[PDB]
Amino acid sequence: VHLTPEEKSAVTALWGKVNVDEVGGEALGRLLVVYPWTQRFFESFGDLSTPDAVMGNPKVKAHGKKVLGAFSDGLAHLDNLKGTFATLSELHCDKLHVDPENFRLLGNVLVCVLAHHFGKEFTPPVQAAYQKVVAGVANALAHKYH
Amino acid sequence: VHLTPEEKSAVTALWGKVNVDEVGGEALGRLLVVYPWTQRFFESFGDLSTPDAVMGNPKVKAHGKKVLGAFSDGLAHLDNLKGTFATLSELHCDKLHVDPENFRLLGNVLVCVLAHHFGKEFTPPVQAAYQKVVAGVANALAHKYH
Amino acid sequence: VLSPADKTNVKAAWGKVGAHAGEYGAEALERMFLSFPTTKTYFPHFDLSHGSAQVKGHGKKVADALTNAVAHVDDMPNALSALSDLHAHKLRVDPVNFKLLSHCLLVTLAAHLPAEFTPAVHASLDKFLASVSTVLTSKYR
Amino acid sequence: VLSPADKTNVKAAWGKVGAHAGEYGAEALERMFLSFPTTKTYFPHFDLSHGSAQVKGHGKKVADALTNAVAHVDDMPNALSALSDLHAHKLRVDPVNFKLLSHCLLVTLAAHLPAEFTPAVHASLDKFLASVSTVLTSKYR
Ligand code: HEM
Ligand code: HEM
Ligand code: HEM
Ligand code: HEM
């Protein structure tokens, strides 16, 4: 990840307005609805049978909050994404066996969710800067896989 | 890239037996035949119409030899691929605009050609070590896109 | 697999795009050019600066081809065969770029139709786009 | 999609496979298990050690379904429907894994059929395996 100074600032301003309690459950829940094979990893979370079932699922929303917490961290450590996600990386590879392609899908769902929330404030250059952040996180999460 | 010494040893021993004249042209030619959109970048090589044209094109053979020369330098700097490859990455991103997904394709194609050229000696453990290497070279080449 | 619910969902959301179609199309392109700069390479003859009229014009075309496709979801291969020759044989567009433009279109739709872009509608659009993408790169399969 | 030329190429390589189809299906699963260890999770109850009688058995079932697919090249979706239900609905196999196994099957065929594996046959086999992959993930869209 390399953002221009314009981009670092824009990323920062937008992140400050994000609703921590909701956007993360929204991203995770849209991941489960749009890419269904991802439900495999959350089979014990209760009813995931319909879009409303997944989205309002309390355990989905709860877990989405932690996932957004980790993004927040990476945003605070853009110059050391790798050291920041090392342990998460081991957990996702060694214990959960998630294919890293899904980290890219999740990052792209997160982008759609920021666009959904921020409308016209989510401009093409701000989207571009978030695209660099998300790919940088997917990358760091994939490091302990090989 | 994290290779244990046994993987290092296995990849280096095989690599010393590679006939680059044969392997290089087959690798590049196969990429152009199997994933035809890649021909767009080699429009200056001439006639790339049919498999027979690609495979007999001298420019394709020659270039494939160079590509293999770059994998050789990476095999010699397994712990510093990113550095070894920074200039080529610049070349591929800024000047050629190749999407990084194709670095993974060519890596997989090189793996099929090595199996094809070494047959049974290209065992499942040696393929596993080469998959780490081609994944590493692909990532080192995408570096400057980030 | 453009299953009943999906169509209906797709026809419905493209419906509220209605007359914004071309501008959404052009915004989707600009978003693609800025986030995934490798894509600019297919358009050497264009001015890709924001505001760009050529991009506005192109966007309108992109948007019209999707409208047709929706109007013809059950018969996409026929409806898009010419564009499929254009894209795979003449221009050789790398297949990955279709995922990039699709992603950018969802982003543009989410940004403009929050009330309609529901999880359910997001899933159906994503599948509609994949299948439009599949038809356009079918010449490589 | 399978052009008659591809069809032919596929029948011919697959016919050269013939009796070893089962051994090659087992080898390809073993290659995939070592190369991409993430795929191991789907087989909790198997002994995945090298030479496991279980992998051999399962390899044979994979080979058969592919022999069937070659035999019904024009009607794959019909021929493989139950398999799609299994992989997509019940097992929820991540789609990216079908690319990993397709590659491993091409690497096994390359290593065992050097004279047959020419560039055009390789192209044809890749399209065919992508078509089988497409059918098996069709319930996801
Ligand atoms: C940017 C991408 C991702 C991030 C930042 C992320 C982050 C997290 C965090 C922070 C935890 C909980 C850590 C803990 O408290 O132990 C976790 C657990 C988990 N993640 Fe992710 N994750 C991401 C992607 C994914 C994807 C794509 C999937 C699968 C489709 C996945 C599946 C899981 C599962 C199954 C758990 C453990 C849940 C449980 O059993 O309690 N993750 N993740
Ligand atoms: C990931 C592995 C790859 C390696 C190691 C590699 C290596 C190289 C090397 C050593 C050269 C010669 C550069 C020079 O003369 O300074 C080069 C040039 C080139 N590469 Fe690659 N490359 C890779 C992948 C690709 C892919 C996948 C494509 C396109 C699909 C591509 C497109 C080209 C082109 C167009 C040139 C310049 C050829 C010419 O016009 O002379 N490369 N590459
Ligand atoms: C949703 C998928 C797409 C659709 C519906 C679409 C639709 C179209 C249409 C309708 C045209 C004009 C045809 C004509 O005027 O005869 C066109 C041309 C073009 N498309 Fe696309 N396209 C798609 C994806 C892409 C992608 C991903 C790219 C590359 C990144 C691409 C690059 C081009 C180019 C370079 C032209 C020629 C423009 C010109 O010089 O007139 N298209 N497309
Ligand atoms: C060429 C693509 C594939 C073919 C032709 C295929 C074929 C089959 C067949 C014939 C069976 C047995 C069905 C039954 O006995 O009910 C099976 C089961 C199975 N397959 Fe696949 N398969 C493919 C890809 C994959 C992939 C990519 C994975 C995961 C990485 C996978 C995981 C499984 C599992 C876990 C089962 C059930 C095993 C058992 O419990 O007996 N398959 N497959």
Description:
The complex is a heterotetramer, with 2 copies of chain A (146 residues) and 2 copies of chain C (141 residues). Chain A is 68% helix and 0% strand. Chain A is mainly α and 146 residues long. The two termini of chain A are 20 Å apart. By secondary structure, chain C is mainly alpha-helical. Chain C has one domain: Globins (Globin-like). Chain C is 70% helix and 0% strand. Chain C has 6 helices and no strands. Chain C is globular and about 40 Å long. The two termini of chain C are 18 Å apart. The interface between A and C is medium-sized, with 23 and 22 residues. Residues 39, 42-43, 61-62, 65-66, 83, 86-87, 91, 93, 97-98, 101, 132, 136 of chain C line the site of one protoporphyrin IX containing FE. Chains A, B: Heme b binds at residues 63, 92. Chains A, B: Involved in oxygen transport from the lung to the various peripheral tissues. LVV-hemorphin-7 potentiates the activity of bradykinin, causing a decrease in blood pressure. Chains A, B: GO terms for molecular function: heme binding; hemoglobin alpha binding; hemoglobin binding; metal ion binding; oxygen binding; oxygen carrier activity. Chains A, B: The modification N6-acetyllysine is found at residues 59, 82, 144. Chains A, B: The modification N-acetylvaline is found at residue 1.
The largest β sheet of chain C comes out as: none
Classify the beta-strand content of chain A into a percent band: under 5%
Number of domains of chain C: 1
The biggest chain-chain interface is: A-C, 23 and 22 residues
CATH H-level superfamily title of chain A: Globins
**Helix share bin of chain A:** 55-70%
Total count of helical runs of at least 4 residues of chain C:
6
Structural class of chain A: mainly alpha
Strand runs of chain C, count = 0
For the record, give the distance between the C-alpha atoms at the N and C termini of chain C, rounded to a whole number: 18 Å
Beta strand % of chain C: under 5%
PDB class: oxygen transport
Keywords: heme, oxygen transport, respiratory protein, erythrocyte, disease mutation, polymorphism
Assembly: tetrameric
Entry title: cross-linked, carbonmonoxy hemoglobin A
